[PDB]
Design a protein around this nucleic acid. Structure first.
Ligand SMILES: [Mg+2]
Ligand SMILES: [Mg+2]
Lengths: 144, 145, 64, 143, 70, 68, 57, 189, 51
RNA sequence: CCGAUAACGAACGAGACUCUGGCAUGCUAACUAGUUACGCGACCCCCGAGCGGUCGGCGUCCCCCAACUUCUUAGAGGGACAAGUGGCGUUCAGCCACCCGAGAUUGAGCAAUAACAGGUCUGUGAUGCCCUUAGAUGUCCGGGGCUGCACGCGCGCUACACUGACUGGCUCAGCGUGUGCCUACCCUACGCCGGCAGGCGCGGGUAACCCGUUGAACCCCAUUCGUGAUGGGGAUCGGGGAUUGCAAUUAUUCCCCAUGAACGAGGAAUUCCCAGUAAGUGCGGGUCAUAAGCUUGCGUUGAUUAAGUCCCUGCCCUUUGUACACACCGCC
């Protein structure tokens, strides 16, 4: 109720788009780059941003206060980085400050809904080759 | 209020030397005159200070006689000189705009004066070949056959 | 005159065929009569355990 | 509740601020508003003739979010796609004189000031009225 | 298509449009041989008159439908 | 597919299984740790490949004869 | 070519070296050119270790 | 509960045949808030079986060059289409979608290499994964050809094509191809 | 044929034809093939793969 | 590789190797990277929130005047091996499925014995021979040409459209370049003038310090258009304005206003391709006094099918035939 220094800072990133959630004890609220996640630009993906808080409910968030800083990538990758960073930050704060026995009954929900919530996508990109336009596609070759 | 076709409606109507479409948008319809682009239409309708969301059929006779005078007297009504066609003309040195068959006559006049002066561009025009220096080895064979 | 359409259960994939590997021989047995089992060449990715419809039963699949 | 402009939808905030700047005729505008294009790549002048108040409302919150922006910064922000005809498309910066005009008009309205370095930044009165607009538009949007 | 209404089409639209389920600009333009810009104009007028209810209001497409029966 | 061990790693593992058999074990981590010091493998990759083959053959020789 | 290459190969190998290869290409009293090889010991061609093992000239 | 696009609970949809019941991913554990999940369901074989069926629709929507990465456009397209089908039918959009795929699943085909000397087109059956793949491909390309050169919106044409295929009244393009492929299978059986 | 047969149990008759091949035709028709020197010394017929 | 085995033990190539990708809240540290906290502010609020909210506002190496490296940077290391389970398999080599895991096939670079009379003397002060050598085939300077078009072919770019175009608003990258021995040519913040392309004056940067927090495009959100060769397409063509150079015509490039051609998804044929891939989409670097429809890289968005087969087409091995060995472009 008045514990100081009760804070973590956990990142989750996808495709060169880093997202660090600075989590701390406080009243239940969410802000990313200073604005609420509801006021996000891809409202077609706003459901995915509110998806983590819906998985384990607003009750488990009502005792915490988190602010996220995001840089790099595109809009979609930033959304994925934000949501997985939120999940990782909350579970890390939980296991740091309260019992992990109660942590398991939410970590299993997170992983069972989507492994990407806590496991960042390892695939990043592929290098271009000097035989074609892309990494694998080659140029039109002709025999006539 | 998005009502029926008004009684003051011309399905097809004549402006200067060519008919224009009343069904189309007011700005996009008058561009059928030979010399007015969509930018010119959008600036001269605004100078005429009338509505834009209505079609050319709605355009009453007073509005038509306003827009024809506006489009025939550009510099008289603070149209920019750089917005014109015949800027700094090669005969009178006067900024102007050419419309309908006047544009055709002026363009043919430029071509035939190039022929008269026997310049490279004139010879290319008279031979039906490209004048901006682009290549003709493999392209433009459609125009010849 | 029309044989009823029913299903069969894949027991195991026998191998590829069709002169390009596009087909796949399979031993499948009907769940309506689990004793009888036939061989069929399927079009598409098939594993063992899943079920697939068969518009006819007396028909069999030869090689290729 | 203390509403920041970051706590609202930007689409609604900008249009409400443009309406505010139309009602307050303090903003001075040039006479070529019905004439010029807003960018080099644009094929046509913008549809709304109050686009000057639209752009003023845009640049006010842009300088709110980050200051020190000059004419080049404004043209980079407002730059867009150029079809380039048969050439493949590129990205081009917008007109710089229009950015000069909007910045000078904002300075004349006196909710923005020149900085000790390049670019300009808001006045306290500036974001006072900006947050006022944000609060009223947030109340209207919520209820 | 008719860019604007006439005697037969306007009152028919006012009499039958809020009586079937799907009311979209493309469907109404095809069904009533109206333009497609007149479709949007007349549909927003119907919405303001209160004979239909909106669903989406999206930039690409806008959906309306007849009032609920009760 | 494509997880066939090379003759180099196979022969090294066979040699060390014969020479240091008591010190080895059924655990991959124990095997790689003892392989670090009982031989000179300048590559970590070539070390733990040997360790995996060693564990696989230990599972065999605990319950039967092999070539080594 | 044979005598000189054999002698230099003897020097290089007997000085103590894992392997060495001398190749001489050109036209020698004949228009159709030819390439002679004299290789012994052990030689490697791929990967990083060739860079700090094999000295070329 | 899952509320795909905020509504349309998946708890009620059932698949009337088990050949597709074990390959459709409409069930509660595969129920997703949005048809946008980068789960690498093409990493290996049979991955796409558990991939959500609406995600399959969105993937199949983006086609023919000009729009090949616009998953957000396809998401809002399927959202609008589900809204249209819900307004003009009233039942579950997922239920009508799955029944449409079931109705359009081609249970037979021909391999065309029934004889290497001369075209014979030996008639073979179809695996259920191929059934669902061909059905969804047929439906998406039917809507694609429906909305090419008219006022008709892509969402509306997709909606009416889907409902026609679900009803199986022969007026859906996917059904028109499914029936004829089965017909050639009958002919050169 | 069995479906459309009038008789309940009609065993279809076979063909009994003995082909004669000149080696020029047989090799080109892949009835017989070239063999290695030791393989030629084998005279037993090839297996049928009947089971 | 394992296995039968007159073979056993080896060596090159492959593999192994180097770089690059993804994980380590473990270590090593950072005012040219910062993050939390603390303190000044400016604004929203007073209904009251008040340890309320925003700050890319300012400071806490301004040096005594907080810590810390999660975030960025990069070194040292570790980590993954078919390791675990199950199943198949001679039960060998291995194969498939699954748990846990960052990862259960990241891409490249390197690359044998040899041959191709393959391309290069127009890369070289590498060069054999031949030619020219003063009216020069040496060398400099002025002009033209390398673009020239009844036509055939190839590589590409723009499109034929509403899954779109226009107009406005929202808005997120990463490679990497940047002032010159010769060599006169740098990247650019900001203010003002111009509608634009541009011009002027103050600066910054030899560079994690400035450009730059690289405010990129696509995308997304609203408006108009409305199936019309239309508001698609921007070919051709007139007029005008600026930049670079000594020189812009045979238009160098760029800007504005004009006109608006074929094209309504393309015959037989043919190419490229399996995961952050195809594909869309912009940005660098090179070429540059002037400049990309090319190429080289980068990044964003982001899929369908398949985890197989010799059917076509090629290549390799084994067998076979040979009067060839200059090796079939042979012999005769
Ligand atoms: Mg190698
Ligand atoms: Mg023009």
């Amino acid at each position: 109720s008045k514990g100081p220094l009760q804070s973590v800072q956990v990142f989750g990133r996808k495709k060169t788009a880093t997202a660090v959630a600075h989590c701390k004890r406080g009243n239940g609220l969410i802000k990313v780059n200073g604005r609420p996640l509801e006021m996000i630009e891809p409202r077609t993906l706003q459901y995915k941003l509110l998806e983590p808080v819906l998985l384990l409910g607003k009750e488990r968030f009502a005792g915490v206060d988190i602010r996220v800083r995001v840089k790099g990538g595109g809009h979609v990758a930033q959304i994925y980085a934000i949501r997985q960073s939120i999940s990782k930050a909350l579970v890390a704060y939980y296991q740091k400050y309260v019992d992990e026995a109660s942590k398991k009954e939410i970590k299993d929900i997170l992983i069972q809904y989507d492994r990407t919530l806590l496991v960042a996508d390892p695939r990043r990109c592929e290098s271009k080759k000097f035989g074609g336009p892309g990494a694998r596609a080659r140029y039109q070759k002709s025999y006539r | 209020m998005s009502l029926v076709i008004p009684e003051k409606f011309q399905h097809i109507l004549r402006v200067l030397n060519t008919n224009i479409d009343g069904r189309r948008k007011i700005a996009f319809a008058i561009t059928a005159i030979k010399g007015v682009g969509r930018r010119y239409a959008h600036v001269v309708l605004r100078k005429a200070d009338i509505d834009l969301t209505k079609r050319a059929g709605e355009l009453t006779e007073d509005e038509v006689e306003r827009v024809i005078t506006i489009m025939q007297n550009p510099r008289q009504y603070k149209i920019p000189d750089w917005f014109l066609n015949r800027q700094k003309d090669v005969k009178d040195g006067k900024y102007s705009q050419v419309l309908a068959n006047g544009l055709d006559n002026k363009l043919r006049e430029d071509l035939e004066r190039l022929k008269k002066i026997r310049a490279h561009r004139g010879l290319r025009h008279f031979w039906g070949l490209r004048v901006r220096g682009q290549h003709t080895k493999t392209t433009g064979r459609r125009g010849r056959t | 005159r029309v044989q009823p359409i029913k299903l069969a259960r894949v027991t195991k994939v026998l191998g590829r065929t069709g002169s390009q590997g596009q087909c796949t021989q399979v031993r499948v047995e009907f769940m309506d009569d689990t004793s009888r089992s036939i061989i069929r060449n399927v079009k598409g990715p098939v594993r063992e355990g899943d079920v697939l419809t068969l518009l006819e039963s007396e028909r069999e699949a030869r090689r290729l | 509740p203390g509403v920041t402009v970051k706590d609202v939808n930007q689409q609604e905030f900008v249009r409400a601020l443009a309406a505010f700047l139309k009602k307050s005729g303090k903003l001075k505008v040039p006479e070529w508003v019905d004439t010029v294009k807003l960018a080099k790549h644009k094929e046509l002048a913008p549809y709304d003739e109050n686009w000057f108040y639209t752009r003023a409302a845009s640049t006010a919150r842009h300088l709110y979010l980050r200051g020190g922006a000059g004419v080049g910064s404004m043209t980079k922000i407002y730059g867009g796609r150029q079809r380039n005809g048969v050439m493949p498309s590129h990205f081009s910066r917008g007109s710089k004189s229009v950015a000069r005009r909007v910045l000078q008009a904002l300075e004349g309205l006196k909710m923005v000031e020149k900085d000790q370095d390049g670019g300009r930044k808001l006045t306290p009165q500036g974001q006072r009225d900006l947050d006022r607009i944000a609060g009223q538009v947030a109340a209207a949007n919520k209820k | 298509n008719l860019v604007l209404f006439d005697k037969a089409t306007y009152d028919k639209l006012c009499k039958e449009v809020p009586n079937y389920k799907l009311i979209t600009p493309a469907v109404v333009s095809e069904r009533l041989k109206i333009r497609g810009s007149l479709a949007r104009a007349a549909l927003q007028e119907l919405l303001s008159k209160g004979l239909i209810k909106l669903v989406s209001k999206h930039r690409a497409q806008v959906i309306y439908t007849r009032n609920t029966k009760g | 597919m494509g997880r066939v061990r090379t003759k180099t790693v196979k022969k090294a593992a066979r040699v060390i299984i014969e020479k240091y058999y008591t010190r080895l074990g059924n655990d991959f981590h124990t095997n790689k740790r003892v392989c670090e010091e009982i031989a000179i493998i300048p590559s970590k990759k070539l070390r733990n490949k040997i360790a995996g083959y060693v564990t696989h053959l230990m599972k065999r020789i605990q319950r039967g004869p092999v070539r080594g | 070519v044979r005598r000189a290459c054999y002698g230099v190969l003897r020097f290089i190998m007997e000085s103590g070296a894992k392997g060495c290869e001398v190749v001489v290409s050109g036209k020698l009293r004949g228009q159709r050119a030819k390439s002679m090889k004299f290789v012994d010991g052990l030689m490697i061609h791929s990967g990083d270790p060739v860079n700090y093992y094999v000295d070329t000239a | 509960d899952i509320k795909l696009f905020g509504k349309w609970s998946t708890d009620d949809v059932q698949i009337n045949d088990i050949s597709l019941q074990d390959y459709i991913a409409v069930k509660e554990k595969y129920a997703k808030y949005l048809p946008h999940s980068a789960g690498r369901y093409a990493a290996k074989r049979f991955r796409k079986a558990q991939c959500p069926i609406v995600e399959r629709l969105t993937n199949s929507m983006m086609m023919h060059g000009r729009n090949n990465g616009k998953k957000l456009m396809t998401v809002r397209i399927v959202k609008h289409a589900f809204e249209i089908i819900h307004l003009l039918t009233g039942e579950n959009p997922l239920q009508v979608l799955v029944n449409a795929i079931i109705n359009s699943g081609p249970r037979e085909d021909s391999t065309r290499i029934g004889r290497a000397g001369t075209v014979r087109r030996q008639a073979v059956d179809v695996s259920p994964l191929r059934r669902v793949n061909q059905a969804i491909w047929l439906l998406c390309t039917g809507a694609r050809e429906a909305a090419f050169r008219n006022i008709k919106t892509i969402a509306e044409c997709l909606a009416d094509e889907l409902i026609n295929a679900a009803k199986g009244s022969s007026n859906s393009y996917a059904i028109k191809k499914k029936d004829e492929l089965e017909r050639v299978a009958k002919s050169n059986r | 044929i069995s479906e459309a047969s009038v008789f309940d149990a009609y065993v279809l008759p076979k063909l009994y034809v003995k082909l004669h091949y000149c080696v020029s035709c047989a090799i080109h028709s892949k009835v017989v093939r070239n063999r290695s020197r030791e393989a030629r010394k084998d005279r037993t017929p090839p297996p049928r793969f009947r089971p």
